[PDB]
Write a protein that holds these residues in place. Structure first.
Motif, PDB file in Angstrom:
ATOM      1  N   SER A 189       0.991   0.353 -12.438  1.00 25.57           N
ATOM      2  CA  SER A 189       1.344   1.221 -11.328  1.00 25.57           C
ATOM      3  C   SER A 189       1.251   0.412 -10.046  1.00 25.57           C
ATOM      4  CB  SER A 189       0.385   2.398 -11.212  1.00 25.57           C
ATOM      5  OG  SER A 189       0.667   3.083 -10.001  1.00 25.57           O
ATOM      6  N   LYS A 191       1.600   1.997  -7.130  1.00 22.61           N
ATOM      7  CA  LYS A 191       1.479   3.044  -6.118  1.00 22.61           C
ATOM      8  C   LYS A 191       0.430   2.728  -5.057  1.00 22.61           C
ATOM      9  N   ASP A 215      -8.828   2.893 -15.666  1.00 24.23           N
ATOM     10  CA  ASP A 215      -7.848   2.436 -14.694  1.00 24.23           C
ATOM     11  C   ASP A 215      -8.488   1.416 -13.758  1.00 24.23           C
ATOM     12  OD1 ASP A 215      -5.180   3.701 -13.013  1.00 24.23           O
ATOM     13  OD2 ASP A 215      -6.676   2.600 -11.869  1.00 24.23           O
TER      14      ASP A 215
END
Length: 330
Positions: A189, A191, A215
């Motif tokens: 990711s 983001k 994560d």
């Protein structure tokens, strides 16, 4: 094109790694900390407050015939360890291991915080996270990798950090002689601007593997492995006498201990961090209390697969249109 450069620990603990970088014409070689957790290429310079320079090599843009002031541009960054730096910006030619980018933003420090001054071995940082984190204002600038990508044979770089030994950063190719087995790729990711991914779990020593999603970010600029408090407690519970010390700032353990390994999951694959990699030595010179290399992330807000984890693997930073990370044993 490709590039290949050796990266060298700055000290006997592998606290960080430095990689030589050529800046300007004629070349000025500075030893930079390649940091996949940030996105600014900044250097100690002839503009840095003199009292804040203590042994570093400086970039002098006035001696580079290819340097150009990026008019109006400033930068200012703060890192997770509380350090910071700021200044103005030039564009210049930057080469790493034979790979050359023209027009790279080279952020010249006017001010650096004490921890940078106190580390004479690091002449600046070369950020390798996503360019959305770059701090240059009012026109955000691209990382060295972003600028080089289109020219590379393959849009990738790899980190092969050594344990108490030199290693390698490669750009544009995957050295199939540098790892064992296969590379397991995992989703990223972007983001938050990081090489953020989800580990599939962990094991402590010879213990059973716990499947659980973790994560975190692959961050060559962070020394240690920062993981959730539950995981870190499970690790240090296997070390007689280990404890979390508020006064020291983390888990410490008897220097007489033999540490167990720590395994993390990458998909169905497993990367094993040998116990010795988790020893960061006496908390102060001559102490028999040693600092642990696995620490809680609870106060950070993100889990960080720093050098302790990454140096156990050959790591592929795949900057294809959909980025991914690859991990292999080595």
């Amino acid at each position: 094109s490709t590039g290949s450069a050796t990266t060298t620990p700055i000290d006997s603990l592998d606290d960080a790694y430095i990689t030589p970088v050529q800046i300007g014409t004629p070349a000025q070689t500075l030893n930079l900390d390649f940091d996949t957790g940030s996105s600014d290429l900044w250097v100690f310079s002839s503009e840095t407050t003199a009292s804040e320079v203590d042994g570093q090599t400086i970039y002098t843009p006035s001696k580079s015939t290819t340097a150009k002031l990026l008019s109006g541009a400033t930068w200012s960054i703060s890192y997770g360890d509380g350090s910071s730096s700021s200044g103005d910006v030039y564009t210049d030619t930057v080469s790493v291991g034979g790979l050359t980018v023209t027009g790279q933003a080279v952020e010249s420090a006017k001010k650096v915080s004490s921890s940078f001054t106190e580390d004479s071995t690091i002449d600046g940082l070369l950020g390798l996270a996503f360019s959305t984190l770059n701090t240059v204002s009012p026109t955000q600038q691209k990382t060295f990798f972003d600028n080089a990508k289109a020219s590379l044979d393959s849009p990738v770089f790899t980190a092969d950090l050594g344990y108490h030994a030199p290693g390698t950063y490669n750009f544009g190719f995957i050295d199939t002689t540098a790892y064992t087995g296969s590379i397991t790729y995992t989703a990223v990711s972007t983001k938050q601007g990081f090489w953020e991914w989800t580990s599939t779990g962990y094991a402590v020593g010879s213990g059973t593997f716990k499947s659980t999603s973790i994560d975190g970010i692959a961050d060559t600029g962070t020394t240690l492995l920062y993981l959730p408090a539950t995981v870190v407690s499970a690790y240090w519970a296997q070390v007689s006498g280990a404890k979390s010390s508020s006064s020291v700032g983390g888990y410490v353990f008897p220097c007489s201990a033999t540490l167990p390994s720590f395994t993390f999951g990458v998909g169905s694959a497993r990367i094993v961090i040998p116990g010795d990699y988790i020893d960061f030595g006496p908390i102060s010179t001559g102490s028999s209390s040693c600092f642990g290399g696995i620490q809680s992330s609870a106060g950070i807000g993100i889990n960080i697969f720093g050098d302790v984890a990454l140096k156990a693997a050959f790591v592929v930073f795949n900057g294809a249109t959909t980025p991914t990370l690859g991990f292999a044993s080595k």
